[PDB]
């Protein structure tokens, strides 16, 4: 373990609000808001607007033109934006020389299950009109937001859309019913989602559907014709659970899956690469992978 994972634990332990307190939605929005790490400033943006929601093309240098990124951030369904996103995706376009389309998609309670789905589907239907080529375009996001990736194959594929090469969900909440040994098991090293918090966003998510429901949790989904896999979980998480349950269920049903559990580290790490090498080296290794993909 790194002087910097100890190190960040500690001041996210500090930093915590204690177990068992009900911070208030808008009170939980404004503060991911403000603690948001400004992007690298030779990380170039523009604003635009797709199937209804604002979005950012976000593009760091070296970016190939065709490529693109479909990216889906976390916040439970129920917080983050393209500002608290717009930093790590940033460097996932340094990476993956790919630019980035970051959706601001619809949250909830004003827009429950299944408005996140409908939006990445819808998304992911307009950069293809656009005449990105399937074979050039990959989908990523963390959290409940790598759930989301999987929810918007599945909604495709049943769709008739074709699928991307590549599909990268960090961290991803796969599995509204949040009962897996996880949640005991890694309870204590996982200084970064406490439950009733995670359950009060399923509740507010779902709003009365199925919490078995494909496109919800796509760890019971039917998987069958998704492209390759890269599954990034840290070893000190509460959902390492989802991601090994996801792989397992990737692989049944014919998908190439590559999971990686990074021994010591936190939910969506990644995000704090600016001080965490591993976050950096994480990143780098998304970006390796969407080209690998694409040079397939």
């Known amino acids: 373990a790194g002087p910097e994972i100890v190190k960040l634990k500690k001041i996210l332990r500090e930093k915590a609000v204690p177990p068992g307190t009900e911070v208030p939605l808008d009170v939980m929005r404004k503060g991911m808001e403000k603690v948001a790490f400004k992007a690298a400033d030779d990380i170039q943006v523009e604003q635009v607007t797709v199937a209804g929601c604002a979005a950012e093309w976000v593009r760091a240098p070296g970016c190939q033109a065709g490529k693109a990124i ?12 393209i500002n608290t996103h717009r930093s790590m995706v940033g ?20 827009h429950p299950f299944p408005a996140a789905v409908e939006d990445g589907v819808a998304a992911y239907r307009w950069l293809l009109d656009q005449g990105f080529k399937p074979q050039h375009l990959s989908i990523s996001g963390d959290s409940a937001g790598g759930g989301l990736v999987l929810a918007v194959l599945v909604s495709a594929r049943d769709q008739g859309l074709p699928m991307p090469a590549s599909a990268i969900p960090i961290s991803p909440w796969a ?11 890694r309870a204590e090293a996982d200084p970064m989602v ?8 399923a509740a507010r998510y ?45 692989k049944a049903d014919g998908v190439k899956s590559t999971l990686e559990i990074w021994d010591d580290m936190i939910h969506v790490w990644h995000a704090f690469h600016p001080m965490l090498p591993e ?7 998304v970006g390796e992978f969407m080209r690998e993909q694409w040079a397939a």
């Open 175 to 185: 599995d509204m019913t949040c009962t897996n040994d996880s949640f005991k098991t």
């Open 206 to 250: 779902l709003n009365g559907a199925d919490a078995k429901h494909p496109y919800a949790s796509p760890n019971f989904a039917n998987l069958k014709g998704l492209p390759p896999l890269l599954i990034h979980v840290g070893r000190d998480e509460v959902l390492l659970d989802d991601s090994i349950k996801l792989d397992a269920k990737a």
């Open 279 to 285: 976050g950096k080296q994480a990143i780098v290794r």
């Open 91 to 110: 460097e996932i376009s340094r990476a993956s020389q790919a630019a980035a389309l970051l959706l601001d998609y619809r949250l909830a309670p004003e």
């Open 70 to 81: 479909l990216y889906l951030h976390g916040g439970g369904y129920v917080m983050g934006s």
């Open 194 to 201: 406490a439950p009733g918090g995670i359950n009060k966003m």
